[PDB]
Amino acid sequence: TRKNVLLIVVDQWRADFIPHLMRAEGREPFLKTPNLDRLCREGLTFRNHVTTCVPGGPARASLLTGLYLMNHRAVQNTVPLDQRHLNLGKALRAIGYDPALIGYTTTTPDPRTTSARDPRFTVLGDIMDGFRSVGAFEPNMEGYFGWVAQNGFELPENREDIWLPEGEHSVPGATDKPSRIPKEFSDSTFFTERALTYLKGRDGKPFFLHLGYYRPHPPFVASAPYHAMYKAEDMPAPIRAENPDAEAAQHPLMKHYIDHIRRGSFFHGAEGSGATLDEGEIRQMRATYCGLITEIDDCLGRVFAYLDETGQWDDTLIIFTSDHGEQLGDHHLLGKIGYNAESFRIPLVIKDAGQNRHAGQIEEGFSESIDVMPTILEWLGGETPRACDGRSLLPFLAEGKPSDWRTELHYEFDFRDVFYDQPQNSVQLSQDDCSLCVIEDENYKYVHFAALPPLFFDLKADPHEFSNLAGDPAYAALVRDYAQKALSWRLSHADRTLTHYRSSPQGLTTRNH
Amino acid sequence: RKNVLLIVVDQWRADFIPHLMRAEGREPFLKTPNLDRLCREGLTFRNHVTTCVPGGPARASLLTGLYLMNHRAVQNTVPLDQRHLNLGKALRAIGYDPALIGYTTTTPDPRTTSARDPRFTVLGDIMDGFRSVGAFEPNMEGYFGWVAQNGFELPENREDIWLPEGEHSVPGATDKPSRIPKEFSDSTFFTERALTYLKGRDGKPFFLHLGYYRPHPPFVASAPYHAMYKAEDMPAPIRAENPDAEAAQHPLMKHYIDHIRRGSFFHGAEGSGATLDEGEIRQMRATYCGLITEIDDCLGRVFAYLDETGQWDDTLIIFTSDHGEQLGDHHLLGKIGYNAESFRIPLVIKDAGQNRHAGQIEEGFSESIDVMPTILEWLGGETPRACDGRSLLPFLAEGKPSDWRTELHYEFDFRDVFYDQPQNSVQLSQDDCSLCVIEDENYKYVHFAALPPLFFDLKADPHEFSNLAGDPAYAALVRDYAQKALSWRLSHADRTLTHYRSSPQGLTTRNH
Amino acid sequence: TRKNVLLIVVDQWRADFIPHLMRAEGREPFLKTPNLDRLCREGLTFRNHVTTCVPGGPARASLLTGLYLMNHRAVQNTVPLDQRHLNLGKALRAIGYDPALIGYTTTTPDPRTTSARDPRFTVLGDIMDGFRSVGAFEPNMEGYFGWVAQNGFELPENREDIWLPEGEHSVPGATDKPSRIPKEFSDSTFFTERALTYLKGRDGKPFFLHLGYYRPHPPFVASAPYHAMYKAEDMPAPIRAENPDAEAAQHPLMKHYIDHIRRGSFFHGAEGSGATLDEGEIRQMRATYCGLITEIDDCLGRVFAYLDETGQWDDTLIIFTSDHGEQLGDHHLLGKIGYNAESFRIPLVIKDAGQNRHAGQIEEGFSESIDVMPTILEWLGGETPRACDGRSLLPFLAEGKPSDWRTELHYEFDFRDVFYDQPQNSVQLSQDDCSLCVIEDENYKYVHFAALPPLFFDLKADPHEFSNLAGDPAYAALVRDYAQKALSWRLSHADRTLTHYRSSPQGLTTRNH
Ligand SMILES: [Zn+2]
Ligand SMILES: [Zn+2]
Ligand SMILES: [Zn+2]
């Protein structure tokens, strides 16, 4: 009996940019993703999914280890992932699968096990040990640019200028002008061709493949025709306080980011404050973001076609997800940082082999990126490792939400200094005191900071997190309650590596409950 | 020439230190002349706690500088991941031989030793990274063989040496001596190993962990210590109306009242730990002081040798206990649960030379995890990045650093081990069988992972009888303490590699 | 300031197929290698280089760890390489260089660090830990066949039938017909393409690249026009004994190989004994073999072009070599097996940076495959690891053969049973007794078997190893001496990982001599 797994991981794709969910609420989608729509219609779409941390580094450690950031300790980009942790790659090998990966993991190696001069200590990060690279973005995007260059397209002196907007009158920033690279040499095409190459090599033998897409990560410019596909005026408006300073008044960490986030990190060549973008420009960006999205969908179309032609579609567990979200103007922020819901809320669509008993349904239960790894391993016939914080989602594909499933969503962020951003200057704390965790449900959200003020939100009254109730004596019992939940969640999720073992007079044994 | 002598007694309560009784205006109800010497020449810390219980957790913390939340040796019989740097490994790194006497009750790491390994057969064994120079060993064979080799005839069942004298003497709280003379006591044994080690060193610099088993039970003493102290001159137990009144406070208290047995505290006895009368509890307390005095006599022997050989003034001497003991407080026997008497332990530090703070009594909030950093940096080393604890040296200089902790912290995990199954009582799986405590001079907040929490007003209710955590009027305070506890957890997440960075320039490191 | 190493490693390319050396000897070359000729013209050609063991797995382990087989213990294909041993990848990372690699290493993993179900324990071998893979043959050649499918070429049901000769009923075996794959999709073009991709991605940044070719490894069939590039009539005749049995009678190990080697392992779909190929058939094979070589040369052309275009040629150390030789019908043998010189004799050409001071010259010092790794590491500024048996060749590019250079060549072969061949059933020995070592110089060769008769050859009279003297009482003193040399070698090359260390009153110390 052949079983395949296709993990599709996009980067920076928000939860609320999924047509199938828009349609269930009664809205007409403002973008098109027909191939995703097929996955959706044929599988289970998760409405309330979060990555348990951001940015890419931490988010991928959580995704590829089943561990919360509090256990995996890859707290930011550039911070080492301890190699004691069992990653998805190493686990799949232990059950006979070859862990093929396309994309990147943005992982910083363990310094105890590699030379200080290792080139990998020179970039944000590199591919996690334990996977087989079959199409790397590679440090500095070299895999891609080499591939562009070997395809006979002549790149500019400064290679990233392929993402300047086209035409010698066009200002960098939000744009309706295409990029300077053709769609047949887009990074999304690059990864897709690597998938097709790999799958064709396999020639019907069972596979695991992590298919990583860079998009819709910035820079926010798209190859033709995706640049003009959608109109600014059809995009939803950003949700924000009256001006950048009103937003900044909420919390010191909010202020650092409002005061520090640059347009140049989201639009190639652009200059100035991300927070000072006007509504018109955010709308345009947003439409470019929709283009990038639809290109991925066109791309998934090719991968699905090859599975159909080779009779593999019904043999394959396809999971579609993102590593993290993106502010996209919400609360005057660009990117993924801080405590706001849009940075953590990501899509999850799972299509079982065969005809899916819940095909087309929308699951409301609270899932977390740490759940993916246990799901895959259980589905391929293996055990969920003891150390994992996450739990297999497979019951959702069966009877439904287990009776003891989590009742709140959990996520974390660590803002200690790295080489390109120094929150600690703004916040005046040392690195071991720069974190927060979040506890959220249908009615409230509590953000607790290691050593700064807490935030509490009535999501019925204030669903966009504008009014901190945390200092209001009238809410003492409620904030108590949520602090207590958060505390119990920590206690219950201390490291589990060896805590199930026991010496006894009858020798070493294991406890299963 | 710098020496370190770490005396770790077992089960010795914070509030059985004469020096502190005297400062409080009381007449010591026991005598510890030698420890009294240390306190007079040194600093006594009055608010010191072990960050967990029982003996393997407490010692993992003590010997790694890590809270239970990071060392994960959450109970006796639960393995200690060997990734964690221990005191002995650290000492070797700064050129000290980590000589150890007694025991650490450490369960080894399954990933680095065979399942058939004999050490997975006992509660625990000496920790990797030390030089054993006098092992209680597993099953206490090191001691027993020493008794046998000294020519003392042992009974069929060896532990019957701690049956009380006389074939008509009732096992239990007893006024009769043990069936072994003091010259073959376990405390005499450990002391003889200590003296052998020290004399072998012949003046060369030294680290030594001098472990004693006492006042661990059984609560029975060699002559004359059985009689030395009187049950009429002991402090009364502080407890509720009856077992059930106390049981009713919390489901874990119920578990322990309902299950602690007398045989775990007096050899061959049986019946319930909770149902001892105040008369019996006081007799027990008399035996305990006896065993305490016997340790003091022993340390006299070890201190004497230090004086003779000119080493006393070079030797950082640290006196402490792995954990406390209820002694019938709250109808409990042992070191379990959340009550302060299981966690409050002694700490007395005598520096080299003349002590700037000789005889003084420190009030700052110290924790067992601080001991290791203290030793290491005293001998010229660094405090490892990974340690939750902090060096105590500033207290022996100018005093409490302006950024010292303002609360005490301690944890307890009560998952099923092979001789007690609290999961049956409280109906939780193992990963939810834990609590942490957060305590200052005014309140204490005991938070459970999956049972109702406890909150006490320490002024009005210094002995933890009236849970206030469900009083709506207390919402804001109970929040505050959950809030502190939550910040402590966040702030004390594992730090092994979280200080490193990659950069355009290569691998670097943040100090702050 | 800028320093590149390109290590080119071909497979099964004999040392006596190097035009530069043939011209030096006075012979008109029977094949063409202009691009290799350029390296020779500009660099140093070593006429007496050997691989210290065969076949692929073991030879590569030696090449890439600097260790003799007596120390790396990867004694055959399928046998694990202990990971305690430090390889080229790991060394390079420790001096700041990315260990990019193309091709394959056929390394069996270390079972103590990897699960028993790891799919890498299912193939002959896979890529060695420590290298970055930027162009894998992959297990099964999937990487290549994936790249052919994706180029739009329609592969047969049994993919490997691309190497059946052209035509409805051309007889498999030594052939003059082309293969059924166009040259634009040959394996040689695949490895090349991946090379160019890699270099184009680097974009001037210093690099290390292991550029591996599969050719001229069998099957012996070539894409058009390489199939008819050379004529049987012009190919050197095989050197062999009068008949197979006569060859067999020299030693039980030879007899086992004569009796078991099949034409199918060298011509795809062929049947019969490789031993029984007549000389016409062998000459045909030799011609096709030259076919594949010149295809490689053509390919090195494109790579050298790109270094020339980009101004990198003068900044690049280029080392050209092979993992092992090939009997190519000599002694009635096909493959790389036993003790004969042609299985071990391999090419080495080294072009230093700048204008080489020994350009064109031919070095005669005895070099071994183990010396390559130290050479590269010293040239890049690092140190020769203390464990290495090999020694740096850079003095040859400076003043010349060091005054204490080895005075003999050493190589080894272990013939314990593997899944696809079982010499233990022929020679009746247990696996720890199934080895030989060779010691050879310009005048004598000694072959020492662990548990079979030894062999001794006078190479002036009998340069082709036909007349074993080892049992002639008149050579007892000479055999003694060579056995004594062999013994002294074993003793002086015992594992050095930690033997330079000492405890002392002062603490831990190191002894440099
Ligand atoms: Zn990302
Ligand atoms: Zn203890
Ligand atoms: Zn080979």
UniProtKB/Swiss-Prot annotation, chain B:
The modification 3-oxoalanine (Cys) is found at G55. It comes from the Bacteria. The keyword Metal-binding applies. The keyword Metal-binding applies. CDD domains: PMH (cd16028). Disulfide bonds: none annotated. Anions including Cl(-) and CH3COO(-), and SO4(2-) salts stimulate activity 20-40% at 100 mM. Its cofactor is Mn(2+). Keywords: Hydrolase, Iron, Manganese, Metal-binding, Zinc. The conversion to 3-oxoalanine (also known as C-formylglycine, FGly), of a serine or cysteine residue in prokaryotes and of a cysteine residue in eukaryotes, is critical for catalytic activity. Phosphate triester hydrolytic activity is retained with unmodified cysteine acting as a nucleophile. Optimum pH is 9.0. InterPro entries: Alkaline_phosphatase_core_sf, HdlasePehA, Sulfatase_N. The active site is at G55. GO terms for molecular function: identical protein binding; metal ion binding; sulfuric ester hydrolase activity. Belongs to the alkaline phosphatase superfamily. Homotetramer. Hydrolytic enzyme with a broad substrate specificity acting on phosphate diesters and phosphonate monoesters. Hydrolyzes phosphate mono- and triesters, sulfate monoesters and sulfonate monoesters. Hydrolyzes glyphosate monoesters. Does not hydrolyze DNA or cGMP. Hydrolyzes glyceryl glyphosate, but this substrate has a much lower affinity than the glyphosate monoesters. This is Multifunctional alkaline phosphatase superfamily protein PehA. It comes from Trinickia caryophylli. The lineage of its organism: Bacteria, Pseudomonadati, Pseudomonadota, Betaproteobacteria, Burkholderiales. The gene is pehA.
